[PDB]
């Protein structure tokens, strides 16, 4: 577990907060965090930002256009996991979807770093095939400001 060296993705886990307090403070403790098990694929959201135009008439170098950073935004998070409706985690997931609310979900990595977001559930799907496990596909739209793993170092 060396943060300063490349690591493989195997061992990543997904967690859901089910407590009261501030998830951003001490997210390294699993107390008051549930877990979604048997995740097949995970695609974390990409943080983006839009642009405002900053070109004026009074400036001299008008040949080349210029711009500047606008209001940032965090993208959507999608993951596919095995369909086990009898498990507590997926029932909590459906309750999360039905009662539209923003709840914090944590991502843990093989090295000792975690990633915390806040978002509501935007999509739930299913895929049925004769020779494969039934899969539950979920997409979560993040809201607010994330807590990247680089903050705590």
């Amino acid at each position: 577990p060396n943060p300063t060296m490349p690591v493989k993705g195997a061992g990543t886990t997904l967690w859901v907060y089910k407590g009261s307090g501030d998830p951003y403070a001490n997210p390294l403790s699993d107390v008051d965090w549930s877990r979604l098990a048997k995740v097949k694929d995970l695609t974390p959201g990409e943080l983006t930002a839009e642009s405002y135009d900053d070109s004026y008439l009074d400036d001299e170098d008008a040949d080349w256009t210029a711009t500047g950073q606008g209001q940032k935004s965090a993208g959507d998070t999608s993951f596919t996991l095995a369909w086990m409706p009898g498990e507590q985690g997926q029932q909590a997931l459906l309750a999360w979807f039905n009662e539209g609310d923003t709840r914090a979900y944590k991502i843990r990595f093989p090295n000792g770093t975690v990633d915390v977001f806040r978002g509501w559930v935007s999509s739930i799907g299913k895929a049925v095939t004769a020779k494969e496990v039934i899969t539950r596909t979920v997409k979560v739209t993040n809201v607010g400001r994330p807590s990247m793993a680089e903050d705590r170092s």
Binding site: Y52, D53, Y56, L57, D58, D59, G70, Q71
Partner: protein, 109 residues
């Protein structure tokens, strides 16, 4: 007199309409002559965007002059200092930046 410092975004509209005294005779003949001794005066229409923190400074500057005092400003159109006055203005407040709209009439006074 105070000078205008903030910069203007592209799309500035310069409208100039001279004043003439016209009489139209029978078969298309006519008489044309200038109305006044002085040359005509343009009316620049500008649009500028400034951050939220700097919006108060510009609003206070335009409010200080009211609609009766004139300030010096050098339009990008011709690059010669002129005397302009702003009778009315408006602003649209976004999340990060405020965008102003105003029409600077040119006055010789």
């Amino acid at each position: 007199m105070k000078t205008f410092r903030w910069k203007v975004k592209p799309g500035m509209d310069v409208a100039s309409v001279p004043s003439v005294r016209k009489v139209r005779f029978g078969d298309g003949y006519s008489q044309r002559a200038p109305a006044g001794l002085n040359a005509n005066l343009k009316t620049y229409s500008v649009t500028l965007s400034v951050p939220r923190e700097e919006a108060t400074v510009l609003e206070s500057f335009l409010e200080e002059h009211g609609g009766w005092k004139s300030f010096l400003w050098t339009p990008p159109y011709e690059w010669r200092q002129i005397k302009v006055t702003c009778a009315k203005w408006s602003s649209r407040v976004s999340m990060l930046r405020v965008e102003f709209s105003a029409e600077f009439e040119q006055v010789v006074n």
